[PDB]
Symmetry: C2
Subunit: 469 residues, 2 copies
């Protein structure tokens, strides 16, 4: 029946995420079960189960990538036996008649379903992490380029001591370095369930090796090694602990806050006309639509993390099946969401448009109200009284403030100072006392050091993933 | 106003957590500010601000612990000058008159409020982690003790292939090892904001050192070193990134699931009469797993506190917005107090779990015959009989016995039916020793022993000094 007549999620269709979506597709699901069956037979034969023939293994080797027809045949078999794994065991054994006898030998259902999911989780991180690396790369190049450009600081979203455009971008950069840290940890923490049997005791395999514990341990480690994993969980019930889904998702939940804060900030800078999203195809009014989408999708990750926390919390004993439906939603959705976020942020950070003039206009309007201490010191320096000067400025500041709020014209405080005889000693020093570059503290130095050290050191292990456009 | 007449959070007035609650007390907040001012003064002197005097440093050193009188005098000033920190600078400098021109020199208010918060986060983790270590220690001793004891397994909470009591405990232990990993990471990831100025640019410290960047950098490094921290955040706005609060709470959120799953399993085992919570004070027949119920209750509360942190960081505009202040005042203390109560309670539970082997064994005996079909068939095949015939014969008796159990409420009589059926005569004398639960536990005892003596032992080795006895 028609796709136009059924709901489809956007993590899937509307936004380009072809590779990530493939990892969580049905074809990759069933193909990965076959890869697991192949390597279960290889390892079992090696460890000593002579019932497995090399010819069975060689057949399975040519049929790891399930075809549309086999999927449909497995669907027919599933509605008959009401078990998707056993349906695929049957169809795989039809395709590979020399292997029909030994496919799934000794294993329980979760041998293929659970190990496949753990494979997908690590494969998914290996898609995400190259994208995050490139976001860090493009934004830090941005930060360095603009390290010297003074910009109005904002606290409570009210005018605050000057920083620089590049320095502000290091805030977003620092959060993304913590994301690289969190994601790399989670990625390299993942192990495989291996062969564990129905309640984790490996009773079935112990029997198949006639009570030889060493053989069972050799099998468990070998099959995981063949799948390219270093870690096999030694103690499980039927399933890998669903607490692993929490710790796999916590870096995604944390990253959501990074993305939402970055995108919110840019949306405000777009309102201020200081920074806009990249040109895409010259309009006066432009919407920061990519950042609004980043906020939208980032916000969705919190509930998926709670899905995982609540699921693990009520897994009774060696497992309950109330993990199954929700995991088919929460795990793909979370990685697809972050995949879309990172690709969008990569598009945004590749071509941020800066308007230094708008930036300078805004600074000019606000800085005189923040330059009181400079005006005071400069007059004391010239022999004036400090409080006498502190009172004279407050008079002019209130007048300027009234002109801004009370009347609506441009801040005229500097003009007022040039018109007040008291301040004559500094009339030719007001350009210097109001020079924005003198107000940005260490913001340029902080930025250069952070890009050149923190960011470079963090990205050095992933240099091979850094691309261009 | 009387304390009986106002709401008090049970996280500080109902459960034992003196130490953790003191970390988040008013006195420790204001005393930590003073500790921050003392080391700010020491660091500024070493880097070259002679305006502060050696006498001031020594006088601040025996007034770091604020008195109730000073707290009260700081409160009379906070109402007057509309600001807590300045009010405490004043009182500290009245209490310490040779440091009064020197306290807070060059710093902004977040130098004390924000650095103190980070100190409390790591100090709080240093309270939690030793309790976690000891929970792991007691429960792993339990798992080893019961590594051999066969127990009905449960999937879908229906009878499943036998495991052992100790092996089941290794599921909880493995989760706790991940909690140790997560918490130790978060604990050691924490740095200090240091001295950063109102927007993170250190403009006022750069001005105070007449433009010497190296002195600003070395001041930032040294004040943080004096407080016992190796990491100083190089790039901030007004404050440390609130994303740090998320990454400090995510191990606590994850641990909430460990605690809830552990305590839910024990409450089910208590229903089954297999395992009960420790005796307190002629034992009562019926006992409630009330400590486990409390663990589930408080564990559940951690999820919302983590969401507090996620959403807070998400909407921090630019160099800071002050919608982080009130909520962080709830979420950070509540989360560490909740996990502290959870660990104390779990330590008490796991120190004296009560196991009833004959209830466990009675349950296995009633279920194992239905699970031993293949074993009975293999026994007949090994006498020389037919797998197909034996399969059908046992299928008939199994359905009769199932009907007795469910339709009649009777004891499972499958074994008696077998011994009563002429077809099964070749295996009559094999049934008793066949149905031996010790032969059905697979590798559960060996898995348990290896896990405790390798994975657990290795995880706890760096923390041996924290292991205590009762
Ligand atoms: Ca071959
Ligand atoms: Ca051995
Ligand atoms: Cl195909
Ligand atoms: Cl098994
Ligand atoms: Cl298995
Ligand atoms: Cl065996
Ligand atoms: Cl959209
Ligand atoms: Cl500061
Ligand atoms: Cl400053
Ligand atoms: Cl309670
Ligand atoms: Mg001039
Ligand atoms: Mg009876």
């Amino acid at each position: 029946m028609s796709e136009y007549d059924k709901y489809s999620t956007p993590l899937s269709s509307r936004y380009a995420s072809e590779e990530m979506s493939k990892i969580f597709s049905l074809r990759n699901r069933f193909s990965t079960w076959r890869k697991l069956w192949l390597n279960l037979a290889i390892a079992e034969k090696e460890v000593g189960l002579s019932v497995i023939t090399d010819e069975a293994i060689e057949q399975m080797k040519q049929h790891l990538e399930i075809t549309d027809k086999e999927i449909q045949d497995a669907a027919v078999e599933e509605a008959k036996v009401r078990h998707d794994v056993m349906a695929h065991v049957h169809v795989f054994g039809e395709t590979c008649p020399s292997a029909a006898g030994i496919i799934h030998l000794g294993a329980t259902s979760c041998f293929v379903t659970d190990n496949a999911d753990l494979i997908f989780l690590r494969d998914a991180y290996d898609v995400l992490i190259p994208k995050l690396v490139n976001v860090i790369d493009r934004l830090s190049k941005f930060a360095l380029e603009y390290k010297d450009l003074p910009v109005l600081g904002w606290t409570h979203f009210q005018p605050a001591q000057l920083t620089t455009v590049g320095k502000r971008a290091t805030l977003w950069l620092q959060e993304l370095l913590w994301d690289l840290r969190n994601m790399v940890r989670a990625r390299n923490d993942i192990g495989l369930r291996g062969v564990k049997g129905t309640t984790g005791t490996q009773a079935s395999f112990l029997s198949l090796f006639h009570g030889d514990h060493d053989k069972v341990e050799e099998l468990d480690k070998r099959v995981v090694e063949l799948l390219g994993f270093d870690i096999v969980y030694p103690v499980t019930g039927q399933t890998y602990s669903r607490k692993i889904d929490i710790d796999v998702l916590s870096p995604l939940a944390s990253f959501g806050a990074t993305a939402h804060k970055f995108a919110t900030d840019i949306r405000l800078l777009a309102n201020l006309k200081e920074i806009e999203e990249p040109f895409e195809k010259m309009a006066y009014k432009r919407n920061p639509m990519r950042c609004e989408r980043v906020c939208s999708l980032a916000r969705h990750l919190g509930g998926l993390f709670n899905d995982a926390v609540q699921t693990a919390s009520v897994q009774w004993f060696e497992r309950t099946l109330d993990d199954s439906a929700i995991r088919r939603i929460s795990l793909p959705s979370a990685f697809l969401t972050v995949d879309i976020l990172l690709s969008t942020m990569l598009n945004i950070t590749s071509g941020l448009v800066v308007y230094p003039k708008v930036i300078e206009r805004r600074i000019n309007s606000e800085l005189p109200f923040m330059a009181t201490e400079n005006i005071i010191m400069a007059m004391v320096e010239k022999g004036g009284s400090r409080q006498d000067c502190h009172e004279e400025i407050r008079v002019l500041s209130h007048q300027a403030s009234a002109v801004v709020k009370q009347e609506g014209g441009d801040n005229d405080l500097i003009e007022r100072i040039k018109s007040t005889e008291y301040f004559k000693p500094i009339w030719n020093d007001l350009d210097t006392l109001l020079d924005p570059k003198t107000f940005v503290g260490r913001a340029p130095q902080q930025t250069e050091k952070f890009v050149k050290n923190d960011v470079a050191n963090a990205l050095k292990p992933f240099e091979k993933y850094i691309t261009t456009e």
